[PDB]
Each structure stands twice: as structure tokens, then as C-alpha cells.
Amino acid sequence: GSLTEDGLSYKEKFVVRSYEVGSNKTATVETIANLLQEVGCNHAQSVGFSTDGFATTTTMRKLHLIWVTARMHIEIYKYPAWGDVVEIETWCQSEGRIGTRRDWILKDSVTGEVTGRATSKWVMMNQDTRRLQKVSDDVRDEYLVFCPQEPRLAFPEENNRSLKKIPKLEDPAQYSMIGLKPRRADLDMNQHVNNVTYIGWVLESIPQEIVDTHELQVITLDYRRECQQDDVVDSLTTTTSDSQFLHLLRLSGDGQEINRGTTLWRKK
Amino acid sequence: GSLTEDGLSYKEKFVVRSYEVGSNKTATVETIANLLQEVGCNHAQSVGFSTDGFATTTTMRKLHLIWVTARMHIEIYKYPAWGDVVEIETWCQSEGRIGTRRDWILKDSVTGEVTGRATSKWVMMNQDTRRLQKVSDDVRDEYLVFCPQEPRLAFPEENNRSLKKIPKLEDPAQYSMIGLKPRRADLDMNQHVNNVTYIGWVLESIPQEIVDTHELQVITLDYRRECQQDDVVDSLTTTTSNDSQFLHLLRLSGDGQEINRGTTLWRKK
Ligand SMILES: Nc1cnc2ccccc2c1
Ligand SMILES: Nc1cnc2ccccc2c1
Ligand SMILES: Nc1cnc2ccccc2c1
Ligand SMILES: Nc1cnc2ccccc2c1
Structure with missing residues (x-):
């Protein structure tokens, strides 16, 4: 794929493979989640970050700091059939000291319609102690130049399905x-x-x-x-x-x- | 990908994905086996066979007959790194009434060198009873026009590793x-x-x-x-x-x- 004209988002096209589909001849949510992970990696590589899944800077590497997923939210309207080309657009946004957010938009290459969308919350932690740290001043200035300055949300709805608290299941489970x-x-x-x-x-x-x-x-x-x-x-x-x-x-x-x-x- | 100039083999290029690599930063043998399966499916589609993994004809579908893998043999010289483009060429060959054979050649797109090769033996069986059967003439004549007439082997060697009998492991296992x-x-x-x-x-x-x-x-x-x-x-x-x-x-x-x-x-x- 490639970074868009403004260099503030990344786009990639994927053909759905024979081993990537389920019983209804369409991609599984695990296939989709794998493609989002892949396009997120290619976006991080295209601007100089690490590509091990942690998207670290030289500063973060010296301090043994990585980015870890805290929450994933995915909404699919249409699962692509095998052979179909799906286009995914991804971007990052800073969420102050709490962490980072990565959003995705999935589209049909032929019709151009939105067939899915995802959002994720990432927190910063020490790889060794497994702690959790506020996004320090020095680390944020290194990634802010690769993020849109105005808010750009895949799920803009004022208080929606991706920002609700999940309760703990009680025993016995069904x-x-x-x-x-x-x-x-x-x-x-x-x-x-x-x-x-x-x-x-x-x-x-x-x-x-x-x-x-x-x-x-x-x-x-x-x-x-x-x-x-x-x-x-x-x-x-x-x-x-x-x-x-x-x-x-x-x-x-x-x-x-x-x-x-x-x-x-x-x-x- | 696409069928070659003679329409007797199929070629496809794959970029190695971030989730497809192991601890060495290179593709796993399971990633390779998945890509061979994918290129085999695209070859079967490009010439009109079924694409559910059974590569059936209307005659086979009528008789509830499918193709099943009996043996797989893979030899890798170099595992592609993520981001590297690997080109796989595949073809089928008839093995008389025993069944069919599908072969693969893996290459580096940049250097053109052979980085791996695979071969597989497929037997025909009834989907329901799970009973194997020798390929009939009517079934054979439907797929022979898509196979090279002269032998084309990924493992040509006089006595190779893909044709040896595998013994049964005895207890206790190590x-x-x-x-x-x-x-x-x-x-x-x-x-x-x-x-x-x-x-x-x-x-x-x-x-x-x-x-x-x-x-x-x-x-x-x-x-x-x-x-x-x-x-x-x-x-x-x-x-x-x-x-x-x-x-x-x-x-x-x-x-x-x-x-x-x-x-x-x-x-x-
Ligand atoms: N409708 C779907 C889609 N993807 C899945 C992936 C894994 C398990 C169940 C699934 C069901
Ligand atoms: N905090 C981060 C991490 N990785 C990124 C990769 C590409 C663009 C922006 C990013 C921001
Ligand atoms: N050297 C390799 C390559 N591929 C593998 C796939 C699965 C498990 C172990 C492996 C080791
Ligand atoms: N027995 C078969 C099955 N599928 C094939 C697909 C492509 C070319 C030849 C084939 C032969």
C-alpha cells in the first residue's frame, strides 16, 4: 500500500484468500483483524517506527517502553468474499496522556462503499515490569507529526459502542x-x-x-x-x-x- | 496470478505479511503450506474446476467424488522475510489410476533463485462413505488436457525423499x-x-x-x-x-x- 497525499493516513488493498474464509464463503472476523494488524504495521514502517507490533521510537527503545492494545472494537456490515478486493485506510490519533488510538475504515474496492470499521486503544508500558506509563513529553512530539491535528474518528457517534464499560461475567456461564x-x-x-x-x-x-x-x-x-x-x-x-x-x-x-x-x- | 503461456501451469506472487512470520523474522512452513494451497485453488479456478479444495468436475460432483491429500512433501532452502515477494509455480500430473500429483516451485522474485519446492499425492474418494477408488477414464480425460504430457517433476531425483515409506513410531515417544x-x-x-x-x-x-x-x-x-x-x-x-x-x-x-x-x-x- 501507500501513505495518502497528506501523509497523515495509510491505504492498502487485499485480495481475500481461499484459506481466509469461513462456512459462508466470506472472510472471518479473525481474517479481518489480521489484515488491520498488517496495514497498521505497514503504516508504522512507512514513517520509520518499529515493526515488531510495538511501533516504538529510538527513545522508547532505550527506556524499554512498548505500545500494547488495551481495547479493540470492530463493526462489520459486509464480509468480503474470497477473490474480492478490500481496501483498508488507517490512521493514528493522540488521546493525551492516556495513550494512542488507531482507527480503520474497510471498503469494497469495486463499489467504494464502507463495509466495516474498527477502532483500538493503545497504552504505553514497560516491556519488562509490565507496568503502565502516561505518554511522556518527548515521546508524544515524536509521533504527533504523523497524526491528523483535527479529530478524525472511525466511530464519531457522541458516546457509542466502543466507549462503554464491559461488566464481569458471573458464574455459572451459559x-x-x-x-x-x-x-x-x-x-x-x-x-x-x-x-x-x-x-x-x-x-x-x-x-x-x-x-x-x-x-x-x-x-x-x-x-x-x-x-x-x-x-x-x-x-x-x-x-x-x-x-x-x-x-x-x-x-x-x-x-x-x-x-x-x-x-x-x-x-x- | 495467471496461467503460463502454454496454459499447463499457474504462477502467483505473494508478499510475506507481518502475521505470517516466526521468531527468525521469516515465513513459517505453515505460511508456505497455506500459500501453496491458495495458488492450487487459483489454478483450479482458472480452468473451471471446483474451488472448495476438492477440485471436482461435474462428473465427480454427480458421483459424490472428491480429491483428498494422501501425502505432502516440502523442502525449503530459504524462508522469505516479511515484505519479500515469493513467486510460486504449480502444475498437476496424472499418476495413472492411483491418483494425481500437484507440484510446486518457490522462487525469490528479485533474484529468481529456487528457494523451495513441494510435491503432493492426491487420491480420489467418495465424500460420504470415505472409500477410495481408482480414477476412471471418464474422470481422467476431463483433467488431462490441463496437465503437461511429458513428466514434469519438482523432485526428479533417482531415489528422492518424497517416495520413501514412513514407519510407525513406537511407544514410548521421546x-x-x-x-x-x-x-x-x-x-x-x-x-x-x-x-x-x-x-x-x-x-x-x-x-x-x-x-x-x-x-x-x-x-x-x-x-x-x-x-x-x-x-x-x-x-x-x-x-x-x-x-x-x-x-x-x-x-x-x-x-x-x-x-x-x-x-x-x-x-x-
Ligand atoms: N460470523 C463470523 C465471522 N467470523 C468469525 C470468526 C471466528 C469465529 C466465528 C466467526 C463468525
Ligand atoms: N503513536 C504512534 C505509533 N505509530 C504510528 C504509526 C504511524 C503513524 C502514527 C503513529 C503514531
Ligand atoms: N523452522 C521452522 C519453520 N516453520 C515452522 C512452523 C511451525 C512450527 C515450527 C517451525 C519451524
Ligand atoms: N486432477 C486435477 C485437478 N485440478 C486441476 C487443476 C488445474 C490443472 C489440472 C488439474 C488436475
Whole structure:
């Protein structure tokens, strides 16, 4: 792909592959999430940041500081069929001392219509202590020149689905998938579990009949803790209602929370 | 991509993606196997066959007959780095009434050098009864016009690694990864476990130290039985050997029913 005319956003076109589609011959939400991650990487490379998924500056590298996803929000109107070309436009925006935001717009290359949109909140943390730091003055001036100065939101709606608090699921869960482990294909270049894997694990506890009669429209996911290579996960789901669900990912042993989220599904 | 000038082979270029690489900053063998599957699907579409992974004709669809992988053989000399463009050329060849063969050649787009090669054996079977059958003349004549008439082998060698019999691993296995289950991302459009998942499951029992100090050079995998969506798998490995060789076994964690058997060859980095 390439940076747009103003150098404040990045665009890339993707053809949907045969192994990237589900039972309804269209891309899965995990395929979409992978393409957003890929276009975010190419945007970070096109302007000089690191490309390991942390988008760091030389200053951030010296201080052992990385960017970590705290929240992901995805809304899909139409999943592209295999062979279809999808165009994704992405940009970053500063959210003061709290962190950074990356937004995406998905379009049909042939019609030009918006078929999806995503937003994500990123926080700064020490890679070793796993702490959390306010965006310091020195670090923000290094990335602000690559962000639009006026607000540019994929989800502009005054107080919408991406800014609501997610509650903690109470036991007993209605549905569950237990004993979920990552394999080497679930790890990234830094040997950490890929963020898309957690989306897949959340969806493992959705009953088969929902998957067979409904299409996933919205997904909001909070990232509270990372699952290590040798950890085992339990995926929990309860219907809160269209069909809505509350989700919970937690360590199979102690029940330590790793993720919490919500999904909205539409009848086919 | 596109069919070549003679319409007897297909070529496609792929850029390596950020999520497609491993710890060495290069594509994994599972990424490669996925790209071979993708280029095979585009070749089947470019000449009118089905695109569900079974590459069927109207005659085969009428008889509930599909093509299934019996063996996969992959040899990688250089794994492409992310951002690198890899060009894959694929073609089919008839192997009499036994079945068909699909071959691949992987190249560096910039240098033009061969960085890998693969071969696979496919058998014809009834979708429902799961019973294999020898290719009839009516079925053979429908695909022969899309195959080179002279033999065209990715592995031409007098006695090569892709035609050797794989023995059954004996208990106790040296290494093992137990309780492996497929998720929805491991299923294809027909809700069957993707063939690349079995390659990943085989490699789950290779010790971390080998993965950290060696690079996978050769992998030969036999597909004896399919793992169902609700099945659990056990992955077993024993060292059989500057190079490291292993014997592999995938089997159902319950009854110990065999699903796959294979061999891997690794070279020191
Ligand atoms: N409607 C969809 C889309 N993508 C999915 C991805 C993983 C699991 C279930 C899904 C259902
Ligand atoms: N805080 C950041 C991080 N990475 C970026 C990559 C491209 C453009 C703007 C960015 C801002
Ligand atoms: N050297 C390699 C290449 N690809 C792999 C894929 C899956 C697991 C281990 C691997 C090791
Ligand atoms: N037996 C088959 C199946 N699919 C093919 C696709 C393209 C060219 C030749 C083929 C032969």
C-alpha cells in the first residue's frame, strides 16, 4: 500500500484468500483483524517506527517502553468474499496522556462503499515490569507529526459502542470452551500470543447454532492480561439479550482474568 | 496470478505479511503450506474446476467424488522475510489410476533463485462413505488436457525423499504434545480441519531447543485419517538421527487411532 497525499493516513488493498474464509464463503472476523494488524504495521514502517507490533521510537527503545492494545472494537456490515478486493485506510490519533488510538475504515474496492470499521486503544508500558506509563513529553512530539491535528474518528457517534464499560461475567456461564492452548502458529515474531488469537478464543464458546444462523456484526474486546505460551485458557459466554453476549477469558487454573468482551450478531 | 503461456501451469506472487512470520523474522512452513494451497485453488479456478479444495468436475460432483491429500512433501532452502515477494509455480500430473500429483516451485522474485519446492499425492474418494477408488477414464480425460504430457517433476531425483515409506513410531515417544484441539480458525469453508493444521500439530511436539537452534529443511507428511471438529489429538516425536531427523505420529487422544505419520529434517542455523 501507500501513505495518502497528506501523509497523515495509510491505504492498502487485499485480495481475500481461499484459506481466509469461513462456512459462508466470506472472510472471518479473525481474517479481518489480521489484515488491520498488517496495514497498521505497514503504516508504522512507512514513517520509520518499529515493526515488531510495538511501533516504538529510538527513545522508547532505550527506556524499554512498548505500545500494547488495551481495547479493540470492530463493526462489520459486509464480509468480503474470497477473490474480492478490500481496501483498508488507517490512521493514528493522540488521546493525551492516556495513550494512542488507531482507527480503520474497510471498503469494497469495486463499489467504494464502507463495509466495516474498527477502532483500538493503545497504552504505553514497560516491556519488562509490565507496568503502565502516561505518554511522556518527548515521546508524544515524536509521533504527533504523523497524526491528523483535527479529530478524525472511525466511530464519531457522541458516546457509542466502543466507549462503554464491559461488566464481569458471573458464574455459572451459559456456554464455555475449556482447555484452550496456543500453538506455535498463534505466536508472533517476539514469541508472544497474537492479539487475534484472543478474538478466536472468545468466539470458541459461542454455540454452533448461533454461528450457523447469525453473522457477527460487532465485537468489543478488553485486553487485561496476556496469556503466556504455556498458559491454558477457559472461554465463557452468556446471552445478555439481534443476539448479544457477554464474554470472559480466564486462566484455566486460578481463574485469573485475561480478557472480557461483548458481541452482537444479526440473523442471516 | 495467471496461467503460463502454454496454459499447463499457474504462477502467483505473494508478499510475506507481518502475521505470517516466526521468531527468525521469516515465513513459517505453515505460511508456505497455506500459500501453496491458495495458488492450487487459483489454478483450479482458472480452468473451471471446483474451488472448495476438492477440485471436482461435474462428473465427480454427480458421483459424490472428491480429491483428498494422501501425502505432502516440502523442502525449503530459504524462508522469505516479511515484505519479500515469493513467486510460486504449480502444475498437476496424472499418476495413472492411483491418483494425481500437484507440484510446486518457490522462487525469490528479485533474484529468481529456487528457494523451495513441494510435491503432493492426491487420491480420489467418495465424500460420504470415505472409500477410495481408482480414477476412471471418464474422470481422467476431463483433467488431462490441463496437465503437461511429458513428466514434469519438482523432485526428479533417482531415489528422492518424497517416495520413501514412513514407519510407525513406537511407544514410548521421546517428546509429546497432548490434548490438541482444532478451533473455528482451523476449519475450512466446508467445516473440515485444514490440512496445514496437521503440519502445525506435528511440529508442536518438536522440543523448543531445536526450534531455537535449527531451521526446518524437509517435512514429509502422510494423511491416514481426518480429525473431526470435536476430536482431540496427541502429537508424538522421536529423534531418529550436523543435521537432526525426527519420526512423528498424530493419533486420537482416546483410542490412539492414527491420523498422521511423518518425518522432519532440520539444519543448524
Ligand atoms: N460470523 C463470523 C465471522 N467470523 C468469525 C470468526 C471466528 C469465529 C466465528 C466467526 C463468525
Ligand atoms: N503513536 C504512534 C505509533 N505509530 C504510528 C504509526 C504511524 C503513524 C502514527 C503513529 C503514531
Ligand atoms: N523452522 C521452522 C519453520 N516453520 C515452522 C512452523 C511451525 C512450527 C515450527 C517451525 C519451524
Ligand atoms: N486432477 C486435477 C485437478 N485440478 C486441476 C487443476 C488445474 C490443472 C489440472 C488439474 C488436475
